Design a protein around this ligand. Structure first.
Ligand SMILES: O=C(NCCCNCc1cc(Cl)cc(Cl)c1)Nc1ccsc1
Length: 495
Protein backbone atom coordinates (compact mmCIF):
# COMPACT_ATOMS: atom_id res chain seq x y z
CA UNK A 1 0.00 0.00 0.00
CA UNK A 2 2.77 2.50 0.92
CA UNK A 3 4.40 3.95 -2.23
CA UNK A 4 8.13 3.77 -2.99
CA UNK A 5 9.75 5.44 -6.01
CA UNK A 6 13.37 4.81 -6.87
CA UNK A 7 15.42 5.82 -9.91
CA UNK A 8 18.82 5.51 -11.55
CA UNK A 9 20.49 8.37 -13.31
CA UNK A 10 19.94 8.17 -17.04
CA UNK A 11 22.82 6.91 -19.17
CA UNK A 12 24.44 8.78 -22.11
CA UNK A 13 24.31 6.44 -25.10
CA UNK A 14 27.15 7.85 -27.25
CA UNK A 15 28.97 4.55 -26.75
CA UNK A 16 28.54 1.04 -25.42
CA UNK A 17 27.24 0.12 -21.98
CA UNK A 18 30.06 -0.21 -19.44
CA UNK A 19 30.43 -1.75 -15.95
CA UNK A 20 29.51 1.56 -14.25
CA UNK A 21 26.07 1.56 -15.87
CA UNK A 22 25.52 -2.10 -14.89
CA UNK A 23 26.63 -1.54 -11.32
CA UNK A 24 24.24 1.36 -10.81
CA UNK A 25 21.32 -0.55 -12.36
CA UNK A 26 22.03 -3.79 -10.37
CA UNK A 27 22.22 -1.91 -7.08
CA UNK A 28 19.07 0.08 -7.75
CA UNK A 29 17.26 -3.09 -8.96
CA UNK A 30 18.11 -4.83 -5.70
CA UNK A 31 16.74 -1.87 -3.73
CA UNK A 32 13.50 -1.86 -5.75
CA UNK A 33 12.98 -5.63 -5.35
CA UNK A 34 13.70 -5.40 -1.65
CA UNK A 35 10.90 -2.87 -1.11
CA UNK A 36 8.41 -4.91 -3.23
CA UNK A 37 9.13 -7.94 -1.03
CA UNK A 38 8.82 -5.69 2.03
CA UNK A 39 5.21 -4.91 1.09
CA UNK A 40 5.64 -1.56 -0.70
CA UNK A 41 4.02 -0.35 -3.90
CA UNK A 42 7.19 0.26 -5.92
CA UNK A 43 7.91 2.19 -9.10
CA UNK A 44 11.44 1.83 -10.41
CA UNK A 45 12.86 3.91 -13.32
CA UNK A 46 15.93 3.91 -15.49
CA UNK A 47 16.70 5.28 -18.98
CA UNK A 48 18.82 7.37 -21.37
CA UNK A 49 19.85 11.00 -21.88
CA UNK A 50 19.93 11.30 -25.70
CA UNK A 51 20.32 15.00 -26.66
CA UNK A 52 23.42 17.23 -27.01
CA UNK A 53 26.24 18.16 -29.36
CA UNK A 54 28.22 14.94 -28.80
CA UNK A 55 25.22 12.84 -29.96
CA UNK A 56 24.76 15.16 -32.99
CA UNK A 57 28.49 14.80 -33.85
CA UNK A 58 28.46 10.98 -33.59
CA UNK A 59 25.31 10.90 -35.77
CA UNK A 60 27.01 12.98 -38.54
CA UNK A 61 30.15 10.76 -38.45
CA UNK A 62 27.86 7.74 -39.04
CA UNK A 63 25.70 9.42 -41.78
CA UNK A 64 22.36 9.09 -39.88
CA UNK A 65 20.01 11.41 -37.94
CA UNK A 66 20.59 11.99 -34.16
CA UNK A 67 17.16 10.33 -33.38
CA UNK A 68 18.16 7.31 -35.47
CA UNK A 69 21.56 7.06 -33.71
CA UNK A 70 19.83 7.33 -30.34
CA UNK A 71 17.36 4.53 -31.29
CA UNK A 72 20.31 2.32 -32.31
CA UNK A 73 22.61 2.94 -29.27
CA UNK A 74 19.93 3.03 -26.58
CA UNK A 75 18.85 -0.48 -27.71
CA UNK A 76 22.13 -1.89 -26.29
CA UNK A 77 21.34 -0.17 -22.95
CA UNK A 78 17.84 -1.72 -23.00
CA UNK A 79 19.54 -5.07 -23.76
CA UNK A 80 21.85 -4.51 -20.79
CA UNK A 81 18.81 -3.97 -18.50
CA UNK A 82 17.32 -7.26 -19.75
CA UNK A 83 20.57 -9.24 -19.37
CA UNK A 84 20.96 -7.90 -15.80
CA UNK A 85 17.39 -9.02 -14.88
CA UNK A 86 16.28 -5.46 -14.13
CA UNK A 87 12.73 -5.08 -12.77
CA UNK A 88 12.35 -1.46 -13.85
CA UNK A 89 8.70 -0.57 -14.41
CA UNK A 90 9.40 1.88 -17.25
CA UNK A 91 12.29 3.03 -19.44
CA UNK A 92 12.61 6.75 -20.15
CA UNK A 93 14.33 8.14 -23.25
CA UNK A 94 14.72 11.92 -23.39
CA UNK A 95 13.95 11.76 -27.15
CA UNK A 96 10.35 10.76 -26.40
CA UNK A 97 7.55 13.25 -26.89
CA UNK A 98 6.31 12.79 -23.30
CA UNK A 99 9.75 14.11 -22.16
CA UNK A 100 9.68 17.02 -24.56
CA UNK A 101 6.26 17.98 -23.05
CA UNK A 102 7.41 17.55 -19.44
CA UNK A 103 10.60 19.62 -19.94
CA UNK A 104 8.70 22.45 -21.64
CA UNK A 105 6.12 22.38 -18.78
CA UNK A 106 8.71 22.54 -15.97
CA UNK A 107 10.58 25.31 -17.90
CA UNK A 108 7.35 27.34 -18.07
CA UNK A 109 6.63 26.69 -14.38
CA UNK A 110 10.07 28.14 -13.52
CA UNK A 111 9.42 31.13 -15.87
CA UNK A 112 6.11 31.76 -14.03
CA UNK A 113 7.94 31.68 -10.70
CA UNK A 114 10.25 34.51 -11.99
CA UNK A 115 13.32 32.24 -12.09
CA UNK A 116 14.37 32.29 -15.74
CA UNK A 117 15.78 35.18 -17.81
CA UNK A 118 17.64 35.82 -21.05
CA UNK A 119 21.26 37.01 -20.87
CA UNK A 120 24.86 36.40 -21.87
CA UNK A 121 27.07 33.47 -20.81
CA UNK A 122 30.38 35.41 -20.95
CA UNK A 123 33.90 34.96 -19.55
CA UNK A 124 37.63 34.29 -19.97
CA UNK A 125 37.97 30.86 -21.43
CA UNK A 126 41.04 28.65 -22.01
CA UNK A 127 40.60 26.31 -24.95
CA UNK A 128 43.62 24.34 -23.73
CA UNK A 129 42.34 23.95 -20.15
CA UNK A 130 38.66 23.76 -21.21
CA UNK A 131 37.80 26.05 -18.29
CA UNK A 132 36.42 29.50 -17.55
CA UNK A 133 38.17 31.86 -15.17
CA UNK A 134 37.39 35.10 -13.39
CA UNK A 135 39.32 38.12 -14.73
CA UNK A 136 41.08 38.30 -11.34
CA UNK A 137 42.63 34.86 -12.07
CA UNK A 138 44.18 36.18 -15.32
CA UNK A 139 47.17 38.30 -16.38
CA UNK A 140 48.41 39.82 -19.65
CA UNK A 141 51.99 38.65 -20.23
CA UNK A 142 55.02 39.86 -22.29
CA UNK A 143 53.74 38.58 -25.64
CA UNK A 144 50.47 40.59 -25.19
CA UNK A 145 48.40 37.45 -24.68
CA UNK A 146 46.20 37.09 -21.57
CA UNK A 147 46.87 33.91 -19.52
CA UNK A 148 44.81 32.03 -16.94
CA UNK A 149 46.14 30.50 -13.72
CA UNK A 150 47.29 27.23 -15.40
CA UNK A 151 49.69 29.17 -17.65
CA UNK A 152 47.64 28.77 -20.87
CA UNK A 153 45.97 31.50 -22.92
CA UNK A 154 42.45 32.72 -22.25
CA UNK A 155 40.10 34.70 -24.43
CA UNK A 156 36.76 36.42 -23.99
CA UNK A 157 33.86 34.37 -25.25
CA UNK A 158 30.20 35.25 -25.14
CA UNK A 159 27.03 33.45 -26.21
CA UNK A 160 23.38 34.20 -25.70
CA UNK A 161 21.84 31.95 -22.99
CA UNK A 162 18.84 31.58 -20.74
CA UNK A 163 19.66 31.41 -17.02
CA UNK A 164 18.00 29.90 -13.97
CA UNK A 165 18.20 32.15 -10.89
CA UNK A 166 20.13 29.59 -8.79
CA UNK A 167 21.55 32.48 -6.74
CA UNK A 168 18.05 32.91 -5.24
CA UNK A 169 18.19 29.36 -3.76
CA UNK A 170 21.31 29.41 -1.56
CA UNK A 171 19.44 29.85 1.76
CA UNK A 172 16.57 27.55 0.84
CA UNK A 173 19.07 24.80 -0.03
CA UNK A 174 21.06 25.25 3.19
CA UNK A 175 17.73 25.06 5.08
CA UNK A 176 16.95 21.85 3.19
CA UNK A 177 20.27 20.19 4.17
CA UNK A 178 19.81 21.27 7.81
CA UNK A 179 16.20 19.97 8.02
CA UNK A 180 16.80 16.74 6.10
CA UNK A 181 20.19 15.37 7.21
CA UNK A 182 19.68 12.33 4.94
CA UNK A 183 18.91 14.38 1.83
CA UNK A 184 22.32 13.72 0.21
CA UNK A 185 24.37 10.66 1.20
CA UNK A 186 26.90 9.29 2.03
CA UNK A 187 28.20 11.77 4.60
CA UNK A 188 31.26 12.87 2.57
CA UNK A 189 28.97 13.88 -0.36
CA UNK A 190 26.88 15.96 2.06
CA UNK A 191 29.97 17.86 3.32
CA UNK A 192 31.05 18.61 -0.26
CA UNK A 193 27.55 19.84 -1.15
CA UNK A 194 27.06 22.00 1.97
CA UNK A 195 30.49 23.66 1.52
CA UNK A 196 29.75 24.26 -2.15
CA UNK A 197 26.44 25.99 -1.45
CA UNK A 198 27.89 27.93 1.51
CA UNK A 199 30.58 29.32 -0.84
CA UNK A 200 27.82 31.09 -2.83
CA UNK A 201 25.78 30.10 -5.87
CA UNK A 202 25.83 31.82 -9.28
CA UNK A 203 22.98 31.79 -11.78
CA UNK A 204 23.04 28.79 -14.07
CA UNK A 205 23.19 28.71 -17.89
CA UNK A 206 20.35 26.42 -19.08
CA UNK A 207 20.16 26.86 -22.87
CA UNK A 208 22.36 26.56 -25.98
CA UNK A 209 22.14 28.16 -29.43
CA UNK A 210 24.91 26.07 -30.99
CA UNK A 211 22.94 22.94 -32.02
CA UNK A 212 19.32 21.97 -32.53
CA UNK A 213 19.40 18.39 -31.17
CA UNK A 214 17.59 19.18 -27.93
CA UNK A 215 14.25 20.42 -26.70
CA UNK A 216 13.36 23.91 -27.94
CA UNK A 217 13.02 26.65 -25.36
CA UNK A 218 9.34 27.65 -25.32
CA UNK A 219 9.03 31.13 -26.85
CA UNK A 220 12.55 31.13 -28.34
CA UNK A 221 13.25 28.05 -30.43
CA UNK A 222 16.68 29.17 -31.66
CA UNK A 223 17.61 28.01 -28.12
CA UNK A 224 17.51 24.40 -26.97
CA UNK A 225 17.62 23.22 -23.36
CA UNK A 226 21.01 22.31 -22.03
CA UNK A 227 21.58 19.13 -20.03
CA UNK A 228 20.41 20.43 -16.59
CA UNK A 229 16.67 20.86 -17.14
CA UNK A 230 16.47 18.21 -19.91
CA UNK A 231 18.11 15.26 -18.16
CA UNK A 232 16.91 15.92 -14.57
CA UNK A 233 13.28 16.23 -15.65
CA UNK A 234 13.20 12.50 -16.66
CA UNK A 235 12.30 11.57 -13.08
CA UNK A 236 8.98 13.42 -13.34
CA UNK A 237 8.31 12.73 -17.06
CA UNK A 238 7.96 9.08 -16.15
CA UNK A 239 5.11 9.86 -13.76
CA UNK A 240 3.11 11.76 -16.38
CA UNK A 241 4.18 15.33 -15.53
CA UNK A 242 2.70 17.90 -16.20
CA UNK A 243 -0.55 15.93 -15.77
CA UNK A 244 -0.81 15.79 -11.96
CA UNK A 245 -4.03 13.68 -12.23
CA UNK A 246 -2.07 10.77 -13.73
CA UNK A 247 -2.26 7.69 -11.44
CA UNK A 248 1.53 7.50 -11.46
CA UNK A 249 1.87 11.05 -10.12
CA UNK A 250 1.24 9.82 -6.52
CA UNK A 251 4.77 8.31 -6.65
CA UNK A 252 6.29 11.82 -6.56
CA UNK A 253 8.44 12.72 -4.64
CA UNK A 254 11.07 10.03 -5.24
CA UNK A 255 12.15 8.11 -2.18
CA UNK A 256 15.64 7.72 -3.59
CA UNK A 257 17.63 8.90 -6.60
CA UNK A 258 20.60 6.59 -7.03
CA UNK A 259 23.51 8.31 -8.78
CA UNK A 260 27.24 8.32 -9.28
CA UNK A 261 29.38 10.61 -7.23
CA UNK A 262 30.40 12.73 -10.26
CA UNK A 263 26.83 14.05 -10.65
CA UNK A 264 26.06 14.73 -6.97
CA UNK A 265 25.99 18.51 -7.33
CA UNK A 266 23.44 18.30 -10.15
CA UNK A 267 20.98 16.18 -8.08
CA UNK A 268 21.54 17.87 -4.67
CA UNK A 269 21.79 21.54 -5.74
CA UNK A 270 20.33 22.13 -9.21
CA UNK A 271 17.45 19.58 -9.14
CA UNK A 272 15.97 20.65 -5.77
CA UNK A 273 16.20 24.31 -6.80
CA UNK A 274 14.33 23.60 -10.03
CA UNK A 275 11.68 21.68 -8.06
CA UNK A 276 11.23 24.50 -5.52
CA UNK A 277 10.86 26.95 -8.38
CA UNK A 278 8.28 24.75 -10.11
CA UNK A 279 6.28 24.32 -6.85
CA UNK A 280 6.99 20.59 -6.49
CA UNK A 281 8.01 18.52 -3.46
CA UNK A 282 11.59 17.34 -3.11
CA UNK A 283 13.01 13.84 -3.25
CA UNK A 284 13.62 12.28 0.17
CA UNK A 285 17.15 11.07 -0.64
CA UNK A 286 19.93 11.26 -3.23
CA UNK A 287 22.49 8.51 -2.73
CA UNK A 288 25.80 8.59 -4.58
CA UNK A 289 27.73 5.37 -5.16
CA UNK A 290 31.42 5.14 -6.02
CA UNK A 291 33.32 3.97 -9.09
CA UNK A 292 34.72 0.54 -9.99
CA UNK A 293 38.27 -0.10 -11.31
CA UNK A 294 39.66 -3.25 -13.03
CA UNK A 295 42.55 -3.81 -10.60
CA UNK A 296 35.53 -4.19 -19.17
CA UNK A 297 32.16 -5.06 -20.90
CA UNK A 298 29.17 -6.03 -18.65
CA UNK A 299 27.81 -8.53 -21.23
CA UNK A 300 31.19 -10.35 -21.21
CA UNK A 301 31.33 -10.33 -17.42
CA UNK A 302 27.82 -11.84 -17.14
CA UNK A 303 28.68 -14.53 -19.72
CA UNK A 304 31.94 -15.42 -17.96
CA UNK A 305 30.81 -15.43 -14.28
CA UNK A 306 27.01 -15.77 -14.39
CA UNK A 307 24.57 -12.92 -13.67
CA UNK A 308 23.86 -13.62 -9.98
CA UNK A 309 27.55 -14.21 -9.26
CA UNK A 310 28.36 -10.75 -10.65
CA UNK A 311 25.37 -9.11 -8.92
CA UNK A 312 26.40 -10.60 -5.60
CA UNK A 313 30.06 -9.76 -6.04
CA UNK A 314 29.44 -6.08 -6.81
CA UNK A 315 26.99 -5.58 -3.91
CA UNK A 316 28.88 -7.61 -1.29
CA UNK A 317 32.51 -6.63 -1.96
CA UNK A 318 32.24 -2.84 -2.32
CA UNK A 319 30.65 -0.88 0.52
CA UNK A 320 27.90 1.05 -1.32
CA UNK A 321 29.07 4.68 -1.57
CA UNK A 322 32.80 3.90 -1.82
CA UNK A 323 35.06 3.26 -4.76
CA UNK A 324 36.20 -0.32 -5.20
CA UNK A 325 37.99 -2.81 -7.44
CA UNK A 326 37.12 -6.08 -9.14
CA UNK A 327 39.42 -8.64 -10.69
CA UNK A 328 39.12 -12.13 -12.10
CA UNK A 329 40.66 -13.65 -8.95
CA UNK A 330 38.51 -11.68 -6.49
CA UNK A 331 35.25 -12.50 -8.31
CA UNK A 332 36.04 -16.22 -8.69
CA UNK A 333 37.17 -16.65 -5.09
CA UNK A 334 34.43 -14.61 -3.43
CA UNK A 335 31.63 -16.21 -5.43
CA UNK A 336 33.08 -19.75 -5.11
CA UNK A 337 33.36 -19.29 -1.30
CA UNK A 338 30.03 -17.58 -0.46
CA UNK A 339 27.72 -18.84 -3.23
CA UNK A 340 28.91 -22.23 -4.54
CA UNK A 341 30.30 -23.46 -1.26
CA UNK A 342 28.56 -21.80 1.70
CA UNK A 343 25.06 -21.35 0.33
CA UNK A 344 24.92 -23.74 -2.60
CA UNK A 345 26.61 -26.72 -1.01
CA UNK A 346 24.70 -26.27 2.28
CA UNK A 347 21.48 -26.67 0.25
CA UNK A 348 22.87 -29.59 -1.78
CA UNK A 349 24.14 -31.56 1.25
CA UNK A 350 21.00 -31.05 3.39
CA UNK A 351 18.46 -31.52 0.63
CA UNK A 352 20.13 -34.64 -0.79
CA UNK A 353 20.01 -36.14 2.74
CA UNK A 354 16.29 -35.38 2.79
CA UNK A 355 15.94 -37.05 -0.63
CA UNK A 356 17.99 -40.10 0.36
CA UNK A 357 16.98 -40.58 3.98
CA UNK A 358 13.63 -38.90 4.47
CA UNK A 359 11.79 -40.18 1.37
CA UNK A 360 12.08 -36.78 -0.35
CA UNK A 361 9.79 -35.17 2.26
CA UNK A 362 10.47 -32.36 4.71
CA UNK A 363 10.97 -34.19 8.03
CA UNK A 364 8.69 -33.68 10.99
CA UNK A 365 10.63 -31.61 13.57
CA UNK A 366 10.66 -32.57 17.25
CA UNK A 367 11.76 -30.31 20.13
CA UNK A 368 14.32 -27.67 19.25
CA UNK A 369 17.63 -27.76 21.15
CA UNK A 370 19.46 -24.56 22.14
CA UNK A 371 21.59 -24.77 18.98
CA UNK A 372 18.45 -25.24 16.84
CA UNK A 373 16.85 -22.10 18.37
CA UNK A 374 19.95 -19.96 18.04
CA UNK A 375 20.26 -20.50 14.28
CA UNK A 376 16.52 -20.04 13.69
CA UNK A 377 16.57 -16.77 15.67
CA UNK A 378 19.73 -15.61 13.91
CA UNK A 379 17.90 -16.00 10.57
CA UNK A 380 14.95 -13.94 11.79
CA UNK A 381 17.15 -11.20 13.13
CA UNK A 382 18.98 -10.92 9.77
CA UNK A 383 15.72 -9.79 8.17
CA UNK A 384 15.52 -6.84 10.58
CA UNK A 385 19.20 -5.96 10.14
CA UNK A 386 18.69 -6.15 6.37
CA UNK A 387 15.71 -3.76 6.53
CA UNK A 388 17.62 -1.13 8.56
CA UNK A 389 20.65 -1.44 6.32
CA UNK A 390 18.56 -1.03 3.17
CA UNK A 391 16.95 2.17 4.58
CA UNK A 392 20.52 3.61 4.42
CA UNK A 393 21.38 2.03 1.04
CA UNK A 394 23.95 -0.20 2.82
CA UNK A 395 23.64 -3.20 0.46
CA UNK A 396 26.89 -4.81 1.66
CA UNK A 397 25.60 -4.77 5.24
CA UNK A 398 22.27 -6.38 4.24
CA UNK A 399 24.12 -9.10 2.33
CA UNK A 400 26.71 -9.44 5.09
CA UNK A 401 23.99 -10.07 7.68
CA UNK A 402 22.30 -12.66 5.49
CA UNK A 403 25.50 -14.49 4.57
CA UNK A 404 26.66 -14.54 8.24
CA UNK A 405 23.48 -16.70 8.79
CA UNK A 406 24.61 -19.00 5.99
CA UNK A 407 28.14 -19.29 7.45
CA UNK A 408 26.71 -20.05 10.90
CA UNK A 409 24.21 -22.57 9.43
CA UNK A 410 27.16 -24.48 7.91
CA UNK A 411 28.82 -24.62 11.33
CA UNK A 412 25.50 -25.72 12.83
CA UNK A 413 25.00 -28.49 10.21
CA UNK A 414 28.58 -29.82 10.47
CA UNK A 415 28.44 -29.73 14.31
CA UNK A 416 25.17 -31.70 14.44
CA UNK A 417 26.55 -34.51 12.21
CA UNK A 418 23.11 -35.64 11.09
CA UNK A 419 24.61 -38.50 9.00
CA UNK A 420 25.77 -40.08 12.29
CA UNK A 421 22.28 -39.72 13.78
CA UNK A 422 20.71 -41.67 10.90
CA UNK A 423 21.53 -44.88 12.76
CA UNK A 424 21.35 -43.85 16.43
CA UNK A 425 18.48 -41.27 16.41
CA UNK A 426 16.60 -40.89 13.11
CA UNK A 427 13.97 -38.53 14.57
CA UNK A 428 16.76 -36.18 15.77
CA UNK A 429 18.37 -36.37 12.33
CA UNK A 430 14.98 -35.34 10.93
CA UNK A 431 14.82 -32.31 13.25
CA UNK A 432 18.35 -31.10 12.29
CA UNK A 433 17.48 -31.50 8.62
CA UNK A 434 14.20 -29.59 9.15
CA UNK A 435 16.12 -26.75 10.87
CA UNK A 436 18.71 -26.57 8.07
CA UNK A 437 15.99 -26.47 5.38
CA UNK A 438 13.94 -23.90 7.26
CA UNK A 439 16.96 -21.65 7.73
CA UNK A 440 17.52 -22.05 3.94
CA UNK A 441 13.94 -21.02 3.26
CA UNK A 442 14.38 -17.85 5.30
CA UNK A 443 17.73 -17.08 3.64
CA UNK A 444 16.24 -17.85 0.22
CA UNK A 445 13.47 -15.33 0.71
CA UNK A 446 15.90 -12.70 1.99
CA UNK A 447 18.35 -12.96 -0.94
CA UNK A 448 15.71 -12.74 -3.69
CA UNK A 449 16.38 -9.03 -4.37
CA UNK A 450 20.13 -9.51 -4.70
CA UNK A 451 20.27 -12.75 -6.72
CA UNK A 452 16.71 -13.27 -8.04
CA UNK A 453 16.97 -16.28 -10.36
CA UNK A 454 19.18 -18.29 -8.03
CA UNK A 455 16.99 -17.45 -4.98
CA UNK A 456 13.96 -18.53 -6.95
CA UNK A 457 15.56 -21.92 -7.82
CA UNK A 458 16.53 -22.41 -4.17
CA UNK A 459 12.96 -21.73 -3.05
CA UNK A 460 11.63 -24.03 -5.85
CA UNK A 461 13.72 -26.96 -4.50
CA UNK A 462 12.28 -26.20 -1.03
CA UNK A 463 8.75 -26.46 -2.59
CA UNK A 464 7.85 -22.97 -1.37
CA UNK A 465 4.64 -21.81 -3.04
CA UNK A 466 4.94 -18.74 -5.28
CA UNK A 467 2.57 -16.79 -3.00
CA UNK A 468 4.67 -17.45 0.13
CA UNK A 469 7.79 -15.54 -0.87
CA UNK A 470 7.28 -12.07 0.68
CA UNK A 471 9.44 -10.94 3.62
CA UNK A 472 6.32 -11.34 5.85
CA UNK A 473 6.56 -15.11 5.06
CA UNK A 474 9.96 -15.38 6.72
CA UNK A 475 8.14 -15.26 10.12
CA UNK A 476 4.66 -16.44 9.19
CA UNK A 477 5.20 -19.40 6.81
CA UNK A 478 7.59 -22.05 7.98
CA UNK A 479 8.17 -25.32 6.11
CA UNK A 480 5.55 -27.96 6.89
CA UNK A 481 6.68 -31.48 7.75
CA UNK A 482 5.54 -34.01 5.14
CA UNK A 483 5.95 -31.67 2.16
CA UNK A 484 7.34 -33.38 -1.00
CA UNK A 485 10.53 -31.82 -2.27
CA UNK A 486 11.84 -32.19 -5.81
CA UNK A 487 15.22 -33.81 -6.42
CA UNK A 488 17.76 -31.13 -5.63
CA UNK A 489 20.26 -29.62 -8.13
CA UNK A 490 23.17 -27.28 -7.33
CA UNK A 491 22.02 -23.66 -7.43
CA UNK A 492 25.58 -22.23 -7.79
CA UNK A 493 28.16 -24.40 -9.54
CA UNK A 494 31.85 -23.66 -8.87
CA UNK A 495 33.74 -21.63 -11.48
O1 LIG B 1 25.12 16.62 -22.48
C1 LIG B 1 24.29 15.81 -22.12
N1 LIG B 1 24.69 14.64 -21.43
C2 LIG B 1 26.06 14.39 -21.13
C3 LIG B 1 26.14 13.25 -20.09
C4 LIG B 1 25.70 13.66 -18.64
N2 LIG B 1 25.60 12.46 -17.79
C5 LIG B 1 25.53 12.74 -16.36
C6 LIG B 1 24.13 13.24 -15.88
C7 LIG B 1 23.04 12.40 -15.58
C8 LIG B 1 21.78 12.91 -15.12
CL1 LIG B 1 20.30 11.98 -14.67
C9 LIG B 1 21.68 14.31 -15.00
C10 LIG B 1 22.77 15.13 -15.32
CL2 LIG B 1 22.55 16.81 -15.15
C11 LIG B 1 24.00 14.63 -15.76
N3 LIG B 1 22.89 15.94 -22.38
C12 LIG B 1 22.30 17.06 -23.01
C13 LIG B 1 20.77 17.27 -23.03
C14 LIG B 1 20.49 18.52 -23.71
S1 LIG B 1 21.88 19.23 -24.19
C15 LIG B 1 22.99 18.17 -23.66
Amino acid sequence: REKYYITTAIAYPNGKPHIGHAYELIATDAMARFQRLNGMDVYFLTGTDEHGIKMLQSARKEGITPRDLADRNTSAFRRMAEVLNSSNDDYIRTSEERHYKASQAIWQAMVANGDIYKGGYAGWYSVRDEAYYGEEETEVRADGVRYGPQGTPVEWVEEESYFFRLSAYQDKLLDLYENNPGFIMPAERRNEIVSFVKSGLKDLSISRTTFDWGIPVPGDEKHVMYVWVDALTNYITALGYPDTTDERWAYWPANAHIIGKDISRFHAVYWPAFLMSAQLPLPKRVFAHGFLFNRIDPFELVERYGLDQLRYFLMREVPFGQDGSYSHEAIVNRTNADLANDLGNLAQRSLSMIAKNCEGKVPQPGAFSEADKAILDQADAALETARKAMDDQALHLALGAIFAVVAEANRYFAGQEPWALRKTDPARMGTVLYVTAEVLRRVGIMVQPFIPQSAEKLLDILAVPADKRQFADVLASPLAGGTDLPAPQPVFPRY
